[PDB]
Design an enzyme around this catalytic site. Sequence first.
Site, short mmCIF file in Angstrom:
data_model
loop_
_atom_site.label_atom_id
_atom_site.label_comp_id
_atom_site.label_asym_id
_atom_site.label_seq_id
_atom_site.Cartn_x
_atom_site.Cartn_y
_atom_site.Cartn_z
N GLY A 1 -8.98 8.88 6.81
CA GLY A 1 -9.23 9.96 6.27
C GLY A 1 -7.27 10.11 6.88
O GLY A 1 -7.04 11.03 5.58
N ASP B 1 0.95 -0.92 -0.05
CA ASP B 1 -0.24 0.00 -0.68
C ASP B 1 1.36 0.85 0.24
O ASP B 1 0.96 1.75 1.25
CB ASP B 1 -0.92 -0.13 1.05
N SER C 1 -6.02 7.73 6.26
CA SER C 1 -4.71 7.62 4.81
C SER C 1 -3.36 7.75 4.18
O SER C 1 -3.98 8.90 3.81
CB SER C 1 -5.98 7.08 3.89
#
Length: 246
Positions: free
Chosen positions: A196, A97, A198
């Site tokens: 949010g 990620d 992230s």
Amino acid sequence: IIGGEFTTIENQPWFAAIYRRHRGGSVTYVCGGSLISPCWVISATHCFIDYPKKEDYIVYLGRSRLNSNTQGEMKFEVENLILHKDYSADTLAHHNDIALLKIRSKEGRCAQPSRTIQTIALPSMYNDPQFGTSCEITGFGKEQSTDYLYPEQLKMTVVKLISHRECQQPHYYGSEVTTKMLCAADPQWKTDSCQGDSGGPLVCSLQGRMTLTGIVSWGRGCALKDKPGVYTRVSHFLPWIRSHTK
Ligand SMILES: N=C(N)Nc1ccc(C(=O)O)cc1
């Protein structure tokens, strides 16, 4: 950020605020990121994977507020959006990620460092702080899991690095956590990253240097007992960072 404190961009001057343009022209916050050099922001692939068109996104640096301008802020278009080719998401976990945004303004400039705009250092390879080290997380994410709104004012908190052994325990996350992830949580579970946050930085002190140790990735709820925040372990991706920023 659940708990912690309000802050301003001068305390985390590498923090990048990433927004997306809608068809119609409304502009909504997407994700955080970290300025690692004048033309490069690092963030999370899961932020962009549904809408992978670089023309849709705006990056601000030197910004302390979500929906209002901060004096001294700089606004950038995305010249390149580099997502990790081996990204995958389970019901919970995001693997690899990590994402790189090459920024450039309407006049074709990168960031000019200032009091409110500075780069953060990458760690040396496979070099992470010891478990129980206190690190800082920064974001515009929810202040409560049940909130509909994001805070207008930037927030930061402190969480402690959890060992892989602890985090891979069944009642935590099992094998969903890998060696390319780091877990971090509050001993009382009272402060955490949330929706949010992230893509935002996990920053720790390493050989007397503030260092980007992690990138906000995933977690079950927020500030839940036995459910740490999970972060991309940046010190395991330097070849991928080096290759795509050459
Ligand atoms: N810290 C947690 N326990 N959870 C949590 C982490 C990241 C995100 C995100 O949206 O990236 C959401 C929830």
